[PDB]
DNA sequence: TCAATATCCACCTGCAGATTCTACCAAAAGTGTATTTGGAAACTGCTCCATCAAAAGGCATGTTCAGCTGAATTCAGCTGAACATGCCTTTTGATGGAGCAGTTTCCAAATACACTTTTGGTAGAATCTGCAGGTGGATATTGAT
DNA sequence: ATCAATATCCACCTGCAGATTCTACCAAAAGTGTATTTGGAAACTGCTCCATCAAAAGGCATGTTCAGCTGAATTCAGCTGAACATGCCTTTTGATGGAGCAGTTTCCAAATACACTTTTGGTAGAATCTGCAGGTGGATATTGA
């Protein structure tokens, strides 16, 4: 009956994921999303395999970066738990809001 | 022979010239501009490949992959600034 | 048909600094993106420089002022060095 | 419900590469919202390049170009 | 000696001003800003236009380039209206 | 021969189509420039300046002044969501900030 | 007996005031002097058009005023009212200026 | 002709205080004034290095406002009004 | 510290996916000529930048003081991590067909040129006028009690 | 629940420092006739892109359970804002020399525009080869005691 303490695994995943480079959002769902958003701008559109891959790359790189800034904001508030207010502040200092 | 060999460069001086003309940058292009610009491009290329080369060596790897280019760039104050708004696909992020 | 890239030139330079190191396809993709980018940034600034100064020709002078404006301190020194060197060696042949 | 396709665990992983150790339960929906605006902005520009070129296939270049003008320059897909 | 003419957008800005606000003036310092504004958007559009053209191996910038440059550059409403005004002028102009 | 008529009038515009058609060719944007291009750009240019002068002119009125000044411009640019986004990285000398 | 505004009352008064005006807030000469000192350290024997120094001040104040807005968001995010160096640094870090 | 020194101190505590005000700042810690001087120096150096680079390329001895406008444009701090 | 549980770390190992390597052809890139012209001197007019003076009052300094804000401490509710489960959405992958990017291949409509007029704009004179900034009531807005 | 203080407001005033008109050229739009192209049509064609189908294989959705994190309360040393006296030094006005932009000309070294020649770089079938992804076995790190 063995169990790990809160966040012991957490730290572990950080180590893991900051060492690899694979995409972390599953391909299919991501493609489905890309196409649906796209269908609002032009209908019956086709996608180069690579265009969808570029989008995901760009997209995840961006998210990982925003989580970086978000964590800085959570830590600034003497917390270890990122929250929406943290994402919101980051995006406002970044000029995206 | 070619202008590159003449300039002692690996990079394609002639192409850089054709590219500077066709890119609507200016009406004319000095003879030196192509040479100069190519020298600069090669140098920076050498710099990154030098650092990413080490990136793979320090990883017991012989073929440089994106991860390596990313590790070399972000771990270098200057390259990092020059490429601060660029994201290298499949390069991940610095550990820690 | 034809789709030129800087791959070959990249690869040469590679061998010149790491004779026994190879480079993955994807990686060569990054190096191309890289070259094209800087190429554009440099040319762009040189383009602007000439326009500010009502000049109609981008000369090596423009390219280097452009290099000083774009590159971080040390990187810009060396780039200027290799640059004026290559032009020099060229005007002597 | 496609946006719901970008799942919690998938988002946990992103935050993790981001170095985040504890995640409030509301980050998940908050993240999808940012994620959606990001794609809408990039894609909208991209597709605009597509139509300009009179094509019906968004190309990796149409995306590289969009990202370039959103200030999110990406290396590895054609410059 | 001839103080070499310096073109501006002042008289046009001013003309337009009178159209929307018949009894309103504009300090020279605000005209200063209005001029910077025009040159700026002009550069952004021509710029995007220039690029769009290059991406499509097209050697000439046409009202279509300008238009899609506009759509890329301006936000929602502002775009919808600018495109209208431009199309309107272009056709008006062709039919004359 | 026939009498001269300016392209601006032909286009029904206040901005200088000729001048814009020139700045385009001289700015090294493309090998060549079509007939419409300048007409279309002078229009867009004229429309946007009518839009900020409309909002600026109101700012002036709201502040009981009859002559627009930089602060009136800022007030107009920052209170209008789209103009604000358009010029979100431009700074209006002498315009201050919105009273937040 | 002597009248005395409570801490912060004058402060909000000052905010309402300066957010209403558009005049520069750094003294002209002190600033022009700071420019020349920095310029000279880059290049000797340099001259400046009057407007060049004003253009610089205009930018500097516009930049500092904007940085303070973000700095303040950082303080408020920390449940504080007093901005501190931590804040200025968090702001610049996210601004990608570092 | 005299030596120039410590002019960063010309940016006085009260001047820095007014800027925070326009900036909407209610309360200010004692250490802000020097961080600010620090941050203003960096901002300035960077705009002046570029402006002056623009100057030299034009083989001139006078930094013009255009030099500065171009400098600012490159830095992503476009200024209108001297343009 | 002990002790069981999992992780994480190394050193080999063998195969399949990419790299390399090898063999060829339009399309650039290098030449050789004849012209063209951008813009580097060589002046030099004259705008405007650095300085000098001087006087004055707006403000920067320093200091005193204590209001109230930031930084500790505690602590209890409850939110978010770890997990063992069970099921289904994603991933893998030939297949086959078809929508479509690219190609050529035309050429009529549409730019680019080169001159030769014909104005629209611009640089100061000259003619006007918001509004800066000085005052005073009246209207709040504050802080003491 | 005032009410003495004193900061803020809002309209009235009117000389003048800037805004708006008034003239005159002249630089640059326009008008024309002529030579050159650009880049949309139309059939065409390999090719990626999409729609299926088919398995397992995870990998994600679920609930439980409780560790430990966050946010609420309370406390207080002392930092930071408000006031005030003092008097420095930024501002404001005005004049002056001369550095050094900026307008003209003069007119070669260097760049553009053909026309041909080669030479190179991109592309499409063949010989390696570097790790990925597993094993096994060995200390480690973590949690329970
Ligand atoms: Cl929140
Ligand atoms: Cl040259
Ligand atoms: Cl057109
Ligand atoms: Cl701090
Ligand atoms: Mn109106
Ligand atoms: Mn000439
Ligand atoms: Mn004193
Ligand atoms: Mn006390
Ligand atoms: Mn408190
Ligand atoms: Mn078809
Ligand atoms: Mn006239
Ligand atoms: Mn007043
Ligand atoms: Mn408990
Ligand atoms: Mn002189
Ligand atoms: Mn070859
Ligand atoms: Mn391995």
Tab-separated table of N, CA, C and O in Angstrom, chain G residues 57-90:
chain	number	residue	atom	x	y	z
G	57	UNK	N	12.851	62.517	-24.522
G	57	UNK	CA	12.135	62.655	-23.263
G	57	UNK	C	10.719	62.119	-23.441
G	57	UNK	O	10.230	61.341	-22.615
G	58	UNK	N	10.062	62.527	-24.521
G	58	UNK	CA	8.723	62.073	-24.772
G	58	UNK	C	8.654	60.556	-24.710
G	58	UNK	O	7.723	59.978	-24.138
G	59	UNK	N	9.633	59.895	-25.308
G	59	UNK	CA	9.613	58.450	-25.301
G	59	UNK	C	9.864	57.930	-23.889
G	59	UNK	O	9.098	57.117	-23.398
G	60	UNK	N	10.919	58.417	-23.233
G	60	UNK	CA	11.258	57.988	-21.872
G	60	UNK	C	10.126	58.064	-20.876
G	60	UNK	O	9.865	57.098	-20.148
G	61	UNK	N	9.456	59.209	-20.824
G	61	UNK	CA	8.334	59.348	-19.910
G	61	UNK	C	7.181	58.413	-20.339
G	61	UNK	O	6.574	57.732	-19.510
G	62	UNK	N	6.907	58.333	-21.632
G	62	UNK	CA	5.834	57.464	-22.075
G	62	UNK	C	6.168	56.041	-21.667
G	62	UNK	O	5.278	55.275	-21.283
G	63	UNK	N	7.453	55.691	-21.707
G	63	UNK	CA	7.868	54.341	-21.338
G	63	UNK	C	7.791	54.148	-19.823
G	63	UNK	O	7.211	53.158	-19.336
G	64	UNK	N	8.354	55.092	-19.069
G	64	UNK	CA	8.319	54.936	-17.632
G	64	UNK	C	6.877	54.940	-17.124
G	64	UNK	O	6.508	54.121	-16.288
G	65	UNK	N	6.031	55.811	-17.660
G	65	UNK	CA	4.649	55.838	-17.193
G	65	UNK	C	3.932	54.514	-17.454
G	65	UNK	O	3.108	54.046	-16.632
G	66	UNK	N	4.260	53.898	-18.586
G	66	UNK	CA	3.616	52.638	-18.918
G	66	UNK	C	4.135	51.503	-18.079
G	66	UNK	O	3.392	50.596	-17.760
G	67	UNK	N	5.417	51.551	-17.722
G	67	UNK	CA	6.035	50.520	-16.901
G	67	UNK	C	5.404	50.587	-15.514
G	67	UNK	O	5.126	49.551	-14.879
G	68	UNK	N	5.169	51.810	-15.031
G	68	UNK	CA	4.560	51.957	-13.716
G	68	UNK	C	3.143	51.398	-13.684
G	68	UNK	O	2.712	50.901	-12.637
G	69	UNK	N	2.416	51.457	-14.808
G	69	UNK	CA	1.065	50.884	-14.809
G	69	UNK	C	1.178	49.390	-14.570
G	69	UNK	O	0.461	48.843	-13.727
G	70	UNK	N	2.092	48.728	-15.291
G	70	UNK	CA	2.263	47.275	-15.132
G	70	UNK	C	2.797	46.930	-13.751
G	70	UNK	O	2.359	45.967	-13.136
G	71	UNK	N	3.728	47.743	-13.266
G	71	UNK	CA	4.333	47.539	-11.955
G	71	UNK	C	3.229	47.534	-10.907
G	71	UNK	O	3.200	46.705	-9.999
G	72	UNK	N	2.299	48.463	-11.063
G	72	UNK	CA	1.191	48.586	-10.142
G	72	UNK	C	0.271	47.341	-10.188
G	72	UNK	O	-0.269	46.893	-9.152
G	73	UNK	N	0.085	46.781	-11.384
G	73	UNK	CA	-0.716	45.577	-11.501
G	73	UNK	C	-0.007	44.480	-10.697
G	73	UNK	O	-0.641	43.725	-9.972
G	74	UNK	N	1.314	44.402	-10.815
G	74	UNK	CA	2.060	43.410	-10.062
G	74	UNK	C	1.911	43.576	-8.538
G	74	UNK	O	1.757	42.579	-7.802
G	75	UNK	N	1.946	44.818	-8.060
G	75	UNK	CA	1.780	45.050	-6.638
G	75	UNK	C	0.379	44.601	-6.214
G	75	UNK	O	0.218	43.800	-5.283
G	76	UNK	N	-0.638	45.106	-6.906
G	76	UNK	CA	-2.010	44.736	-6.578
G	76	UNK	C	-2.195	43.220	-6.627
G	76	UNK	O	-3.016	42.659	-5.915
G	77	UNK	N	-1.429	42.555	-7.475
G	77	UNK	CA	-1.553	41.115	-7.597
G	77	UNK	C	-0.987	40.446	-6.372
G	77	UNK	O	-1.340	39.306	-6.072
G	78	UNK	N	-0.093	41.158	-5.683
G	78	UNK	CA	0.549	40.657	-4.470
G	78	UNK	C	-0.251	41.098	-3.259
G	78	UNK	O	0.200	40.969	-2.117
G	79	UNK	N	-1.435	41.644	-3.512
G	79	UNK	CA	-2.274	42.105	-2.425
G	79	UNK	C	-1.597	43.280	-1.717
G	79	UNK	O	-1.812	43.499	-0.541
G	80	UNK	N	-0.780	44.029	-2.444
G	80	UNK	CA	-0.083	45.195	-1.903
G	80	UNK	C	-0.540	46.481	-2.602
G	80	UNK	O	-1.146	46.453	-3.661
G	81	UNK	N	-0.230	47.617	-2.010
G	81	UNK	CA	-0.600	48.896	-2.609
G	81	UNK	C	0.694	49.645	-2.928
G	81	UNK	O	0.741	50.507	-3.797
G	82	UNK	N	1.748	49.283	-2.214
G	82	UNK	CA	3.047	49.904	-2.385
G	82	UNK	C	3.899	49.207	-3.445
G	82	UNK	O	4.396	48.111	-3.207
G	83	UNK	N	4.088	49.827	-4.600
G	83	UNK	CA	4.922	49.194	-5.615
G	83	UNK	C	6.366	49.060	-5.099
G	83	UNK	O	6.858	49.921	-4.364
G	84	UNK	N	7.026	47.967	-5.480
G	84	UNK	CA	8.409	47.669	-5.066
G	84	UNK	C	9.257	47.156	-6.240
G	84	UNK	O	8.730	46.772	-7.277
G	85	UNK	N	10.591	47.116	-6.076
G	85	UNK	CA	11.449	46.634	-7.168
G	85	UNK	C	11.052	45.263	-7.719
G	85	UNK	O	11.207	45.003	-8.921
G	86	UNK	N	10.549	44.401	-6.839
G	86	UNK	CA	10.096	43.071	-7.223
G	86	UNK	C	9.144	43.261	-8.371
G	86	UNK	O	9.282	42.647	-9.415
G	87	UNK	N	8.155	44.113	-8.142
G	87	UNK	CA	7.145	44.398	-9.142
G	87	UNK	C	7.739	44.908	-10.453
G	87	UNK	O	7.476	44.341	-11.502
G	88	UNK	N	8.535	45.970	-10.408
G	88	UNK	CA	9.124	46.484	-11.638
G	88	UNK	C	9.826	45.364	-12.403
G	88	UNK	O	9.732	45.286	-13.632
G	89	UNK	N	10.504	44.486	-11.670
G	89	UNK	CA	11.223	43.377	-12.287
G	89	UNK	C	10.328	42.285	-12.870
G	89	UNK	O	10.648	41.725	-13.911
G	90	UNK	N	9.205	41.997	-12.214
G	90	UNK	CA	8.279	40.970	-12.683
G	90	UNK	C	7.700	41.472	-13.980
G	90	UNK	O	7.609	40.736	-14.969
